[PDB]
């Protein structure tokens, strides 16, 4: 009510629709713990009496 501005506005008009009630969901974590560190000899080193 007290200022004039030119407003150029873009109004989206679309819809996302799913068809197939099928999915498999995996939570994959820990890449660095396997490729960065030891897995085989590191474990054998723990067995020293």
Residues that bind other proteins (CB under 8 A): 2-5
Give me the least distance between CB of 3 and other proteins, in Å please.
4
CA distances 4 to 1, 7, 14, 15, Å, are 8, 9, 31, 34
- Identify the CA nearest to 31 among candidates 42, 41, 23, 39: 39
């Amino acid at each position: 009510g007290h200022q004039v501005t030119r407003e150029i506005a873009a109004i989206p008009f679309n819809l996302h629709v799913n068809n197939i009630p099928f999915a498999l969901e995996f939570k994959i974590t820990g890449f660095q713990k396997v490729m960065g560190e030891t897995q085989f000899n590191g474990k054998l080193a723990d067995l020293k009496p």
